[PDB]
Design a protein around this ligand. Sequence first.
Ligand SMILES: O=c1ccn([C@@H]2O[C@H](COP(=O)(O)OP(=O)(O)O[C@H]3O[C@H](CO)[C@@H](O)[C@H](O)[C@H]3O)[C@@H](O)[C@H]2O)c(=O)[nH]1
Length: 326
Amino acid sequence: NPSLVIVSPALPGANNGNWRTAQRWKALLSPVCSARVVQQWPDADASADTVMLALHARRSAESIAHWAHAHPGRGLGVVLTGTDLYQDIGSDPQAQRSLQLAQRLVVLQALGAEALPPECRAKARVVYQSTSARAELPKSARQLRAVMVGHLRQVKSPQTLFDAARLLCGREDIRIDHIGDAGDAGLGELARALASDCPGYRWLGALPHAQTRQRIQRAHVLVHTSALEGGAHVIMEAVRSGTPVLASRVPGNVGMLGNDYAGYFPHGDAAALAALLEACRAGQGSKDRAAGLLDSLRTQCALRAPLFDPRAEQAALFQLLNELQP
Ligand SMILES: O=c1ccn([C@@H]2O[C@H](COP(=O)(O)OP(=O)(O)O[C@H]3O[C@H](CO)[C@@H](O)[C@H](O)[C@H]3O)[C@@H](O)[C@H]2O)c(=O)[nH]1
């Protein structure tokens, strides 16, 4: 059986996407190979590795190079997690070199290969991520509770959420919970000042993943404003909890929710987001109502939900492994 090494830049045990992906892939591939996760390669155990899957064409570029030089033409998959595909590979030589050296390039939703140079598309492979489902909860019509989840950095465009919450500062019937570490400098100060001014907006800080999944499950709607995504875990998690999504219309989000999804706003457009939230609120009512925006979005998200089934991610990873060690 193959001996797979997964390279993740994330600090071990970190509560973020890069660590989550590596540990989940390890678990899904364990029945057909010996799999391990490292932050860099090689290490003492490198001689027995036969396949490498490396997350982020730039952050892992050094381990990717080490593998490519030790195993030219063989065994290397490079996973495009987001800022590499939608930023770095434009002009970062390290990210560009990882694209050339790889035997396969993994993108995390169907649109990802459009951002690759055309000479890299033949070796590109789509692997939708997966997450465990949660029962869809019945929810009250008395208030609209929205949540957004993302450690604060500029690529998450949290200012769109700040500005839309400000536009709704007077609305007692709408609540916005914001989950995520302070991160990029100054953004935490913006969240704190906004929560002090507008009681409907709460910045909860970073929360353990278990509690975050529960809050996504409880919310009426998840908002995601990012300038770019590889394929966001939190959108998956909402969809697989029966919670519909309002998302910025950028390729990483569109690949997750579908070209026909009715819950997009243009990136950076806080008034558009605020108006979608108002429409979600306006549509709320009793079991004897019909045809609210939230209900149309729930119907659409339910059609997306099978994309994020772990048995499906596993089968695609099995195929990927077979291609990297035939
Ligand atoms: O306070 C917090 C903040 C985050 N999360 C979790 O963090 C995870 C990962 O978040 P995600 O939405 O995927 O964002 P990133 O961490 O930025 O992940 C990056 O990398 C992933 C691949 O590893 C891609 O799928 C994403 O698009 C890309 O943004 C999710 O499971 C969240 O529930 C928490 O539990 N608590």
